[PDB]
């Protein structure tokens with residue numbers, strides 16, 4: 034019917050993301066009964082789904098099919114998001130780099 | 143593309159024409 | 175000709191027919207079972223690796239002869255860190271031969287290749303560890 | 306794992322990224338060039354390259370080795386010699402521990418070959434399977450094993466634990482249906498009646514010591530007593546246990562299965578079992 | 593001269609058509625099709641080879657025994673001379689004897 | 690609401706299953722609706738590119754049957770007589786015409802009729818080839834899973850934009866269990882186009898999914914081939930072809 038503009042694969046983690054996701058972890062789990070919440074596990078699929086589903090549509094970054102099975106505990110999800118990811122062509126990033134004047138690279142497309 | 147239909151064996155027995163010579167005789171026999 | 179039918183005899187036909195899956199063996203009250211059989215311990219031991227059993231729930235240690243003189247023994251399905259396993263068997267078989275083994279490993283297939291038959295030694299070694 | 310976390314970063318696999326295990330497919334070496342091309346590994350001059358060498362085992366007119374040796378009766382009538390596959394009671398103890406064949410029911414060559422204990426090649430003229438004395442220790446089967454051949458130690462070990470041993474001869478086409486009946490059940494013909502043993506194995510299958518199915522039951526207590534007297538072990542009268550009836554379940558001659566009998570046609574699709582119900586047909590199948 | 597002065601026309605390679613897109617399909621009908629059929633009866637070809645391998649002799653003897661009665665006289669005559677020349681060739685000519 | 694699948698087969702104690710997202714085609718923006726844990730031994734096998742080499746090119750080869758042929762000096766017409774006397778003339782000794790030397794003569798070592806490169810691999814190797822095929826897809830995030838292949842619009846335009854909006858790839862496969870239950874909407878789309886091909890679960894093979902840049906399954910299909918390949922893993926010894934009946938296996 035209508036195709037909205039595509040979402041850019043590039044994504045950078047905003048500040049205080051730990052506070053944002055932690056506020057939602059307490060929303061899913063009444064309240065977080067045990068301390069040391071970083072070691073909390075996600076054996077159930079409903080808990081893992083509602084957790085990862087809110088993270089994606091709220092931030093704008095989806096966990097691939099190859100990594101969610103590795104995201105066993107919550108701290109792994111914290112390490113997967115605090116690291117950034119980028120999306121630009123090699124020509125774009127090389128031109129963005131501080132190349133010297135003598136060097137030049139073209140793009141014949 | 144829609145794939146061609148899956149090859150399946152003939153449902154029910156296979157009774158050849160007895161008055162048809164290219165059909166071998168062991169089908170006409172009682173053992174078949 | 176005539177023919178009369180019966181169906182009560184059908185139970186003998188299914189006792190006669192074979193199966194298509196290996197049944198999980200009975201839980202014997204006494205272990206080790208006769209014929210030197212011993213199922214794997216449960217839960218497994220937390221390690222960098224693990225060795226699974228075969229279709230018949232046996233140990234995947236096998237022998238092989240090649241060139242008429244290559245008198246070796248192999249293991250098939252090492253899972254995880256093979257370097258930890260091959261180091262253990264190297265230290266285990268070292269004092270028997272007086273020298274460190276010079277065996278070969280293939281972490282792609284997860285296999286080992288050890289000179290000399292030590293299957294009876296490796297079987298008892300893997301059983302007492304609980305693989 | 307350490308294997309999968311590499312592939313997610315590594316590029317996608319396709320036909321261009323495809324390669325076999327190095328060392329499997331060695332490269333073909335054709336005789337074209339300087340190295341092979343000159344003579345292609347056939348020699349300088351002679352029958353070696355001309356292709357007119359003699360047959361295999363030729364000594365250049367001298368008598369070959371295979372004619373100077375005299376003939377002797379090594380393998381004559383090998384297509385009719387007596388053959389049977391071994392079976393060790395060690396394996397029987399092993400297979401029941403695995404649970405593929407149940408000791409609660411009578412063990413049989415059908416239950417055995419349905420368990421894939423040992424292969425059998427009836428067209429390779431093996432009329433059954435024998436028991437093997439190797440495995441006398443660590444044996445508590447208590448099974449009613451059906452066999453063709455049997456050793457003295459195997460019978461003593463089985464009877465000591467309370468089991469039952471019995472010989473039962475099968476013909477070639479009567480055995481291949483026994484070891485594998487279901488394809489004949491895809492044919493629809495009636496299962497054939499067994500025959501008596503041949504004109505030389507009848508003294509064996511009629512003797513009581515070897516547990517012959519033609520021998521009397523009255524003589525088996527005597528043979529059991531002598532084995533207990535021989536190998537020094539108590540003789541457990543198996544009449545006490547609740548499953549004594551199961552242990553004595555045996556098939557008469559001219560019958561394959563304890564349930565089925567000759568003439569009984571069986572069907573699986575729209576499962577039905579049929580009789581002839583003719584006096585001429587019925588009275589022969591009993592014969 | 594063997595080479596050609598002018599180039600040939602650029603042959604268009606259609607990597608997405610009915611055959612190449614549906615290539616390799618229905619090869620595992622036995623593995624995950626409850627073994628109702630074998631992949632050997634799938635292939636379209638002569639009747640003297642449907643799921644079977646053979647050398648020059650093996651394919652020829654299978655041909656004359658199966659369809660030789662339907663073959664032509666000239667083709668059948670050349671077939672007998674072929675196997676007769678190849679029978680003696682493999683048996684008498686070559687290395688390894 | 691979410692759609693969860695829990696594996697019905699048993700799993701090893703020392704290998705946990707692997708979760709995977711689930712999608713659909715009712716809406717456009719709809720993504721990540723439902724999960725499905727998967728058996729590790731079939732979805733986490735080693736890479737084994739040598740296995741893919743054999744089984745993929747195997748189905749390239751065994752279906753091939755040649756038709757090339759060259760007439761030998763006996764088959765080419767003529768060449769029965771001797772053209773000239775052995776020592777009568779200066780010309781080189783030649784027994785007849787149509788030899789490999791003469792023009793138009795028969796070939797000495799050439800193609801011989803329709804050959805057959807047919808050879809069957811072990812069922813366990815071919816099965817394991819299927820086990821490892823969709824495994825590497827899971828590592829590379831190439832495959833996808835969804836509930837059913839229904840869409841209201843049903844045209845190639847919506848299907849194409851849906852693909853490279855989720856960034857699947859150029860070439861895709863569609864899988865279903867049987868040949869009858871495919872909706873008429875999705876099948877009419879795939880028939881018009883060529884890239885986003887469609888096949889049933891019975892016709893699933895490694896070469897198509899390796900040729901196509903991505904893969905798609907349905908939850909009934911995921912349980913189907915899982916039951917088959919795990920049954921191949923815990924398989925019993927084959928005494929006879931599986932076409933004949935069994936006790937538990939149909």
Ligand SMILES: [Mg+2]
Pocket residue numbers: 238239
């Ligand atoms: Mg070997």
Ligand SMILES: [Mg+2]
Pocket residue numbers: 350351
């Ligand atoms: Mg010489």
Ligand SMILES: [Mg+2]
Pocket residue numbers: 349350
């Ligand atoms: Mg010369």
Ligand SMILES: [Mg+2]
Pocket residue numbers: 357
């Ligand atoms: Mg000569």
Ligand SMILES: [Mg+2]
Pocket residue numbers: 762763764767768769
């Ligand atoms: Mg001629």
Ligand SMILES: [Mg+2]
Pocket residue numbers: 769770
């Ligand atoms: Mg002439």
Ligand SMILES: [Mg+2]
Pocket residue numbers: 784
């Ligand atoms: Mg001549």
Ligand SMILES: [Mg+2]
Pocket residue numbers: 760765793794795
């Ligand atoms: Mg020509």
